[PDB]
Design a protein around this ligand. Structure first.
Ligand SMILES: CC(=O)c1nc(NC(=O)C2(N)CCC2)sc1-c1cncc(N)c1
Length: 130
């Protein structure tokens, strides 16, 4: 219905706002663009499912997120990718890992504080009916 399309539009508006707030945070600059396949060639080999904040914005606009859970799966993917590609004790690796986990914790905290539980529940119930 049109009520349901209004629900999803509200979700997209909310997701764009959260994603913008993540993308302007200086700590998260490394997660804002895809990994250049020239700049580092072993990435697309180790990371089978790359994900970044600009790709998150594209998926929002393509209506690929019908629930905040769908969105948080891709946030989780940005983080776990970073942990897996950077597993070493070197300080470069530890810094990215620290930032990846901060990205994840920040997104979950914003959603927990600002997304109404019933709004998300509605999104899920519309999703299950399709
Ligand atoms: C996204 C990611 O996981 C990522 N990880 C990197 N890791 C490192 O450079 C090391 N510490 C381990 C190799 C040294 S670079 C990088 C990245 C690569 N191209 C572009 C952008 N925006 C980030």
């Amino acid at each position: 219905s049109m009520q349901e399309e209004d629900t999803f539009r509200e979700l997209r508006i909310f997701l764009r706002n959260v994603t913008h707030r993540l993308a302007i945070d200086k700590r998260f600059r490394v997660f804002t663009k895809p990994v250049d396949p020239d700049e580092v060639p072993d990435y697309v080999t180790v990371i089978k499912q790359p994900m970044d904040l600009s790709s998150v914005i594209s998926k929002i606009d393509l209506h690929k997120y019908l629930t905040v859970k769908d969105y948080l799966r891709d946030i989780d993917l940005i983080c776990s990718n970073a942990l897996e590609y950077n597993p070493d004790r070197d300080p470069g690796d530890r810094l990215i890992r620290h930032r990846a986990c901060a990205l994840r914790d920040t997104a979950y905290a914003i959603i927990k504080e600002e997304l109404d539980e019933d709004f998300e529940q509605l999104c899920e119930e519309i999703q299950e009916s399709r």
